[PDB]
Design an enzyme around this catalytic site. Structure first.
Site, PDB file in Angstrom:
ATOM      1  N   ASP A  25      60.288  17.982  -6.536  1.00 34.09           N
ATOM      2  CA  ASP A  25      61.021  17.305  -5.579  1.00 34.09           C
ATOM      3  C   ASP A  25      60.852  15.896  -5.431  1.00 34.09           C
ATOM      4  OD1 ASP A  25      61.884  16.882  -2.996  1.00 34.09           O
ATOM      5  OD2 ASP A  25      60.517  18.187  -1.949  1.00 34.09           O
ATOM      6  N   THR A  26      62.015  15.139  -6.064  1.00 41.59           N
ATOM      7  CA  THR A  26      61.690  13.715  -6.022  1.00 41.59           C
ATOM      8  C   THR A  26      61.826  12.965  -4.587  1.00 41.59           C
ATOM      9  OG1 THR A  26      64.136  13.367  -5.966  1.00 41.59           O
ATOM     10  CG2 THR A  26      63.038  13.729  -8.073  1.00 41.59           C
ATOM     11  N   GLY A  27      62.267  13.675  -3.627  1.00 40.33           N
ATOM     12  CA  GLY A  27      62.204  13.315  -2.270  1.00 40.33           C
ATOM     13  C   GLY A  27      60.822  13.451  -1.585  1.00 40.33           C
TER      14      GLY A  27
HETATM   15  C1  LIG Z   1      56.984  16.905   1.682  1.00 41.10           C
HETATM   16  C2  LIG Z   1      57.215  15.377   2.021  1.00 41.10           C
HETATM   17  C3  LIG Z   1      56.262  14.525   1.675  1.00 41.10           C
HETATM   18  O1  LIG Z   1      55.056  14.812   1.322  1.00 41.10           O
HETATM   19  C4  LIG Z   1      56.319  13.090   2.164  1.00 41.10           C
HETATM   20  C5  LIG Z   1      57.403  12.561   2.499  1.00 41.10           C
HETATM   21  C6  LIG Z   1      58.856  13.359   2.549  1.00 41.10           C
HETATM   22  C7  LIG Z   1      58.544  14.894   2.242  1.00 41.10           C
HETATM   23  C8  LIG Z   1      59.762  15.671   2.400  1.00 41.10           C
HETATM   24  O2  LIG Z   1      59.645  16.715   3.243  1.00 41.10           O
HETATM   25  N1  LIG Z   1      60.735  15.519   1.821  1.00 41.10           N
HETATM   26  C9  LIG Z   1      61.926  16.104   1.995  1.00 41.10           C
HETATM   27  C10 LIG Z   1      63.182  15.086   2.484  1.00 41.10           C
HETATM   28  S1  LIG Z   1      63.332  14.677   3.872  1.00 41.10           S
HETATM   29  C11 LIG Z   1      62.305  13.185   4.131  1.00 41.10           C
HETATM   30  C12 LIG Z   1      61.842  12.743   5.289  1.00 41.10           C
HETATM   31  C13 LIG Z   1      61.501  11.530   5.614  1.00 41.10           C
HETATM   32  C14 LIG Z   1      61.124  10.836   4.295  1.00 41.10           C
HETATM   33  C15 LIG Z   1      61.494  11.240   3.089  1.00 41.10           C
HETATM   34  C16 LIG Z   1      62.214  12.424   3.018  1.00 41.10           C
HETATM   35  C17 LIG Z   1      61.882  17.214   0.799  1.00 41.10           C
HETATM   36  O3  LIG Z   1      62.122  16.214  -0.317  1.00 41.10           O
HETATM   37  C18 LIG Z   1      63.078  18.124   0.748  1.00 41.10           C
HETATM   38  N2  LIG Z   1      62.711  19.243   1.295  1.00 41.10           N
HETATM   39  C19 LIG Z   1      61.860  20.026   0.275  1.00 41.10           C
HETATM   40  C20 LIG Z   1      61.243  21.070   1.012  1.00 41.10           C
HETATM   41  C21 LIG Z   1      60.170  20.979   2.181  1.00 41.10           C
HETATM   42  C22 LIG Z   1      59.727  22.288   2.719  1.00 41.10           C
HETATM   43  C23 LIG Z   1      60.676  22.934   3.699  1.00 41.10           C
HETATM   44  C24 LIG Z   1      61.530  23.335   2.619  1.00 41.10           C
HETATM   45  C25 LIG Z   1      62.343  22.220   1.580  1.00 41.10           C
HETATM   46  C26 LIG Z   1      63.174  21.510   2.780  1.00 41.10           C
HETATM   47  C27 LIG Z   1      63.738  19.941   2.232  1.00 41.10           C
HETATM   48  C28 LIG Z   1      64.519  19.442   3.048  1.00 41.10           C
HETATM   49  O4  LIG Z   1      63.804  18.628   3.847  1.00 41.10           O
HETATM   50  N3  LIG Z   1      65.816  19.437   3.132  1.00 41.10           N
HETATM   51  C29 LIG Z   1      66.883  18.724   3.961  1.00 41.10           C
HETATM   52  C30 LIG Z   1      68.147  19.434   3.732  1.00 41.10           C
HETATM   53  C31 LIG Z   1      66.390  19.078   5.552  1.00 41.10           C
HETATM   54  C32 LIG Z   1      66.749  17.454   3.992  1.00 41.10           C
END
Ligand SMILES: Cc1c(O)cccc1C(=O)N[C@@H](CSc1ccccc1)[C@H](O)CN1C[C@H]2CCCC[C@H]2C[C@H]1C(=O)NC(C)(C)C
Lengths: 99, 99
Positions: A25-27
């Site tokens: 996951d690059t995000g």
């Molecule tokens: C896990 C994590 C960290 O440790 C640090 C920073 C961000 C994240 C994080 O949750 N990043 C997410 C982007 S949403 C995001 C929000 C704020 C900043 C950056 C990204 C994940 O890349 C993607 N994330 C992967 C994963 C997270 C656990 C739940 C199932 C998916 C949900 C998915 C997600 O959120 N999808 C949407 C369609 C709602 C956008």
């Protein structure tokens, strides 16, 4: 490998002697795995994403193999819907986005 | 181009003539953009991330240009902190993860 994205980029990882499936996951800035017992002392930590914050256990200097590449870094363990390999370990294995 | 992951993969997108910054996210199945008034009808939808679900408005057939590359697909608009370009659009620009 060159992974396309028509499907979720899941891969097998080996951690604590167990095989698990995890999403590249690059995000995600961090690596967050499902609840599991790892050796080592851990520190409580809080991380957030869409939806809010969750409580996790922070384990440092954990050895993890992603598609055979070794990485040694911080791994957060807690109630994540899916196992996530974030940028802290993707950089270690030399992963890049390309188009 | 080749984007490394030392930093969050933020790139410039253009949508409706407006330039915006957005995160290339292989972990996101969907594209989620910050609140904005798009013309067109939309469908309510709930999406979940790490800490839970959030309500968003789904718009279809939206054209977004990612680093000069056009993509057209569904975008969810809601109170997100960052614009997220998910896999539904990433595949369209031939984006791959490589290691
Ligand atoms: C896990 C994590 C960290 O440790 C640090 C920073 C961000 C994240 C994080 O949750 N990043 C997410 C982007 S949403 C995001 C929000 C704020 C900043 C950056 C990204 C994940 O890349 C993607 N994330 C992967 C994963 C997270 C656990 C739940 C199932 C998916 C949900 C998915 C997600 O959120 N999808 C949407 C369609 C709602 C956008």
């Amino acid at each position: 490998p060159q992974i396309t994205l028509w499907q979720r980029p899941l891969v097998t990882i080996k951690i604590g002697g167990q095989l698990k499936e995890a999403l590249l996951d690059t995000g995600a800035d961090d690596t967050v795995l499902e609840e599991m017992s790892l050796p080592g002392r851990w520190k409580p930590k809080m991380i957030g994403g869409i939806g809010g914050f969750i409580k996790v256990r922070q384990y440092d200097q954990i050895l993890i193999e992603i598609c055979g590449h070794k990485a040694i870094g911080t791994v957060l363990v807690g109630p994540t819907p899916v196992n996530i390999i974030g940028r802290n370990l993707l950089t270690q294995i030399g992963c890049t986005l390309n188009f």
